[PDB]
C-alpha cells in the first residue's frame, strides 16, 4: 500500500519548470502538500479536499497545484529559483481532520548551471595497522568527493549483503567548494573479521544526476543517475 | 509601534430554544473592523470601519463562505465535546477561540497565539514554539492527539506566520490611507 510520490530526485536549472505528482491512498479525498527545506521546520503549502482548495498557506504564486478526478494531485512549478531547492512531502488523509499519511517525499535541488553537475569520486582506505593492533576494532573510512549536487545515499555492502550495524555516516555532506561537495563514512569492524581474506567489503555511493529529458552539452559524458562503488578484500597480516 | 490583528470566535449553545448562535469578530490592533453574526435575517460579514468598507466585493463573499464553514464544524464540536465530558444532552455550552498574530514595528512576527476555551475555562492552546500543544484536561489530551495525527499544527503555524502577517500589512495599509 502506501501513498506514492514521483519523481523523487530532480535536477532543474535556474529558471526552469517541473511538475511533482502525488498518488494518494485509494479513497482518500483530502490531499496536502508540505515543503520542507534542507534547513529545518515544516512549511505548510496548500491542502486540497475533494478536488477543491481548502486552505492556502505558504504556496507562492509561481507554484500551482490541482486535484484530478483520480484525486491524485500534481504540483506545477514555474520559474524555479535556488530558494525553491528543498524536499516536498505529500500527506493524504481520508477526510479533513483524520490521520494523514505522508509520501516518500521528493528532493528538488535547483542548480545555477547544469554543467556543474558531476558524479562523485569514491575511494576506500583500509584501516591503519596500528588501529587493529591496539584497539582491535578496524575502521574502513570511505571518502566520496567531487559530486554536485548532494543527491547521494552512501551504503556499506559486505559479502554482497547490505549492512547497517556499526557503520557511521556523516549526516550532512560537507561542501568543499562552491560547486563540489564531499561525503565520508567509516565502518568499524573487528580485527578477526577484517583479517579474514575471504570477506568482501564494498562502499557504494548512489548519485541521482540529470534526467534524460535535460539536454547535455556535448564534449562530456552525461552525469546520469548512477551509483559508483569502491571495494576492498580483507587482508591477513 | 507594534501592531496586532486578532479574531474572537463565539459558539454559544442553546438546546431546544434554537441553534447555536455563532459569531466571529475581527480586531485590528484593538479596534474591531469586521463581524459575522449567525442570528440575522440574512447573515454575512460586515465591515465595522470606513477603511474596511474599501475592501473588494469578492472579499466579503470569499470570507462568508469560510465563516459559514467554520459554523458547521463548531456546531459538530459542541456535540463532540459532550461525548468527551458526558454532558447532559440538553444543556447550554460555549466555545471561545482567540486567534491572532502581533508584529513589531519592523513588520516581523513577534508572537502568534490560538487559545480554545470551554465554558469560561481553558481547553487547549498553541505553544510559543508554534509546533506543539498544551492540553488542559483529559478531553483535550484526546483532541491534541487528533491534531498531531492530522498535521493541524502546521496549518495553524503557516496561517500565523504567513497569512496573518500578510493580511495585517494589507489591513493596516487601508486604515492608514483612510
Amino acid at each position: 500500500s502506501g501513498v506514492v510520490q514521483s519523481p523523487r530526485h530532480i535536477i532543474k536549472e535556474k529558471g526552469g519548470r517541473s511538475v511533482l505528482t502525488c498518488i494518494p491512498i485509494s479513497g482518500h479525498s483530502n490531499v496536502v502538500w508540505y515543503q520542507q527545506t534542507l534547513g529545518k521546520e515544516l512549511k505548510f503549502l496548500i491542502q486540497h479536499y475533494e478536488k477543491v482548495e481548502r486552505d492556502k498557506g505558504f504556496l507562492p504564486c509561481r507554484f500551482s497545484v490541482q486535484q484530478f478526478d483520480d484525486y491524485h494531485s500534481e504540483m506545477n512549478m514555474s520559474a524555479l529559483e535556488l530558494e525553491d531547492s528543498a524536499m516536498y512531502f505529500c500527506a493524504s488523509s481520508l477526510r479533513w481532520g483524520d490521520e494523514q499519511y505522508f509520501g516518500p517525499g521528493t528532493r528538488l535541488t535547483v542548480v545555477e548551471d547544469l554543467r556543474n553537475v558531476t558524479p562523485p569520486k569514491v575511494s576506500l582506505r583500509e584501516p591503519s595497522k596500528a588501529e587493529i593492533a591496539n584497539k582491535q576494532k578496524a575502521t574502513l573510512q570511505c571518502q566520496a568527493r567531487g559530486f554536485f549536487p548532494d543527491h547521494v545515499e552512501l551504503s556499506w555492502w559486505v559479502n554482497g549483503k547490505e549492512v547497517h550495524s556499526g557503520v557511521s555516516t556523516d549526516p550532512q555532506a560537507y561542501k568543499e567548494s562552491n560547486y563540489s561537495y564531499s561525503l565520508s563514512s567509516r565502518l568499524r569492524v573487528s580485527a578477526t573479521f577484517w583479517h579474514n581474506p575471504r570477506n568482501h567489503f564494498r562502499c557504494q555511493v548512489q548519485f541521482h544526476g540529470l534526467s534524460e529529458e535535460d539536454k547535455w552539452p556535448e564534449g562530456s559524458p552525461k552525469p546520469v543517475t548512477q551509483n559508483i562503488s569502491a571495494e576492498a578484500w580483507g587482508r591477513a597480516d | 509601534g507594534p501592531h496586532s490583528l486578532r479574531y474572537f470566535v463565539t459558539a454559544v449553545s442553546r438546546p431546544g430554544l434554537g441553534e447555536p448562535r455563532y459569531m466571529e469578530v475581527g480586531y485590528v490592533d484593538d479596534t474591531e473592523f469586521v463581524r459575522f453574526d449567525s442570528d440575522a435575517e440574512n447573515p454575512r460579514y460586515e465591515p465595522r470601519a470606513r477603511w474596511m468598507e474599501q475592501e473588494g466585493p469578492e472579499y466579503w463573499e470569499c470570507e462568508t463562505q469560510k465563516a459559514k464553514g467554520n459554523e458547521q464544524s463548531f456546531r459538530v464540536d459542541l456535540r463532540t465535546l459532550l461525548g468527551y465530558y458526558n454532558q447532559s444532552k440538553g444543556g447550554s455550552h460555549t466555545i471561545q477561540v482567540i486567534s491572532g498574530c502581533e508584529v513589531g514595528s519592523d513588520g516581523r512576527l513577534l508572537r502568534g497565539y490560538q487559545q480554545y476555551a470551554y465554558d469560561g475555562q481553558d481547553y487547549i492552546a498553541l505553544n510559543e514554539d508554534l509546533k506543539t500543544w498544551t492540553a488542559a484536561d483529559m478531553a483535550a489530551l484526546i483532541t491534541k492527539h487528533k491534531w498531531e495525527q492530522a498535521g493541524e499544527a502546521e496549518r495553524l503555524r503557516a496561517y500565523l506566520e504567513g497569512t496573518c502577517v500578510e493580511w495585517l500589512r494589507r489591513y493596516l495599509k487601508n486604515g492608514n490611507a483612510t
Binding site: - | V9, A67, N70, F74, S99
Partner: peptide, 8 residues
C-alpha cells in the same frame, strides 16, 4: 483574513 477551523 480568517482561519478555516476544522474539527477538533
Amino acid at each position: 483574513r480568517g482561519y478555516v477551523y476544522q474539527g477538533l
